C-alpha cells in the first residue's frame, strides 16, 4: 500500500514535508549535471504507474531544462524537449516515458524512464518486446510519448476534429481534389 | 474556388477496377484461409439513432452479453464460432432483445460445429 | 532515375521477382473443401455448390440468378 500512500503524498505538493524534500533536492540536482543518470527512481509510485520495472534494462535519467518562452510559445512541451535530450544522450535506448520531479524558478526537472531494447531480459519478456520492435525508434522525437499525444491533441470528440488522426493528414484529405472516372 | 494548389493536391482514381479485383482476391484469400467458414462474422440487428432514420434498422457491431446469454451462446465461445461481441451496447428494450436473440437462434439452428480435432 | 539508367547501362543481371503472393487464393490440403474447390470458379459459386453461405451480412449488390451463398 506504500505506493498509494506515496500517491497521496505526491498529490499534496506544498505540504511541509514535500516542500522541504523538494527544496533540498532541487539544490542537489542543480549542483549535479544538467543530464545525469538516476539509479533509484525519486518518485517510485509515479515510475511504477508510468511503466517502470526493477528489471535489468530499465534506467532513469533526470534532466533539467530552462523554462520560459521563445512572446512566442514553443508548440512542444518542456517535458518533450527534456525527453528528446535524454534520448539523444542515451541513443541506444528507447524513451518509455517521463515525469515531473521538481520545478525551481529557473529550470524544470524531469525523470525519464528508458528501456534497453537489445537486452536479453527485455527481449524475452513480452509487453516490452513491442518497444524492442523497430517501429518505435525515437518516439520522443516523433511525438509518440504521452507529452507528444497531449501536444498533438489525440483525443476523440467534436472539440478535436482537426487534430485526431493527424492534423496535416486531415488538412490534405480536406484539400485534395477527388476526380472519379465517371463524373 | 482554386485559391490553393489543387494541382499539387489532385487525385485521379484510374485504379478503380484494379482496386476492385484486389479486394475480390483478398476476399478469396480470406475464404481460402477460412474454407468452411463464411468469411464474415454475424452482426446484430440495431436501430439507427436519429429521428430521421429511427424507422429503419441496420447491422450493428456485435451482440450484447445478456442477449448472448438469453440465446444460450457462451461469451468466450461466441467469437470462436464467429459471432461478433460488443460489450458497450445495451439493450434497453425487450424489442431489440427479442430481435437479436431470434437472430442468434437462427444462427444456432443453421450452424454446423466441428468436433474440435 | 539515375539508378534506373545505371542498371540499364551495366552488365549486371536484372533480378526478376517471381509473382509470389503473401496469401493463398485457393484452399489446399486433403479435406472436403480442398478436393471440391474449383480453381476457375468464384467464392460465391464454390460456396453455392457446397451448399454453404459466404456472407453473413445483407447483400450490397445484385447477386447471380442462382446465387445461394449471400444471405
Amino acid at each position: 500500500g506504500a505506493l498509494k500512500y506515496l500517491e497521496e503524498l505526491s498529490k499534496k505538493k506544498q505540504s511541509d514535508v514535500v516542500r522541504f524534500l523538494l527544496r533540498v533536492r532541487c539544490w542537489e540536482y542543480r549542483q549535479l549535471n544538467v543530464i545525469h543518470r538516476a539509479s533509484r527512481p525519486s518518485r517510485p509510485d509515479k515510475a511504477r504507474r508510468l511503466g517502470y520495472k526493477a528489471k535489468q534494462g530499465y534506467v532513469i535519467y533526470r534532466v533539467r531544462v530552462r523554462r520560459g518562452g521563445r512572446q512566442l510559445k514553443y508548440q512542444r512541451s518542456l517535458r518533450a524537449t527534456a525527453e528528446e535530450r535524454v534520448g539523444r544522450r542515451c541513443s541506444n535506448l528507447r524513451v518509455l516515458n517521463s515525469y515531473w520531479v521538481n520545478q525551481d524558478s529557473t529550470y524544470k526537472y524531469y525523470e525519464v524512464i528508458l528501456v534497453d531494447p537489445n537486452h536479453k531480459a527485455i527481449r524475452r519478456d513480452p509487453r516490452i518486446n513491442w518497444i524492442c520492435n523497430p517501429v518505435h525508434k525515437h518516439r520522443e522525437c516523433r511525438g509518440l510519448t504521452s507529452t507528444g499525444k497531449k501536444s498533438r491533441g489525440l483525443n476523440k470528440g467534436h472539440r478535436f476534429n482537426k487534430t485526431r488522426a493527424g492534423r496535416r493528414k486531415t488538412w490534405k484529405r480536406h484539400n485534395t481534389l477527388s476526380l472519379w472516372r465517371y463524373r | 474556388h482554386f485559391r490553393k494548389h489543387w494541382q499539387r493536391r489532385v487525385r485521379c482514381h484510374f485504379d478503380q477496377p484494379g482496386k476492385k479485383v484486389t479486394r475480390r482476391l483478398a476476399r478469396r484469400a480470406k475464404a481460402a484461409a477460412l474454407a468452411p467458414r463464411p468469411v464474415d462474422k454475424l452482426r446484430p440487428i440495431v436501430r439507427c439513432p436519429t429521428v430521421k432514420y429511427n424507422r429503419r434498422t441496420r447491422l450493428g457491431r456485435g451482440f450484447t452479453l445478456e442477449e448472448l446469454k438469453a440465446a444460450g451462446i457462451p461469451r468466450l465461445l461466441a467469437p470462436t464460432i464467429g459471432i461478433a461481441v460488443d460489450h458497450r451496447r445495451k439493450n434497453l428494450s425487450e424489442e431489440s432483445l427479442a430481435a437479436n436473440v431470434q437472430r442468434l437462434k437462427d444462427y444456432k439452428a443453421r450452424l454446423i460445429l466441428f468436433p474440435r480435432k | 532515375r539515375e539508378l534506373q539508367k545505371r542498371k540499364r547501362r551495366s552488365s549486371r543481371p536484372t533480378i526478376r521477382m517471381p509473382n509470389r503472393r503473401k496469401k493463398a487464393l485457393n484452399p489446399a490440403g486433403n479435406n472436403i473443401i480442398a478436393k471440391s474447390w474449383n480453381k476457375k470458379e468464384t467464392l460465391s459459386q464454390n460456396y453455392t455448390r457446397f451448399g454453404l453461405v459466404a456472407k453473413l451480412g445483407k447483400a450490397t449488390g445484385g447477386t447471380a440468378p442462382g446465387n445461394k451463398a449471400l444471405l
Partner: peptide, 21 residues
C-alpha cells in the same frame, strides 16, 4: 506469448464451423 493468453488460446481456440444455406 503471455501465459494468460496461452491459457485462453488453449481452452478457447478458433473452432471450425460451417453455416448452411
Amino acid at each position: 506469448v503471455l501465459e494468460k493468453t496461452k491459457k485462453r488460446l488453449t481452452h478457447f481456440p478458433q473452432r471450425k464451423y460451417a453455416v448452411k444455406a
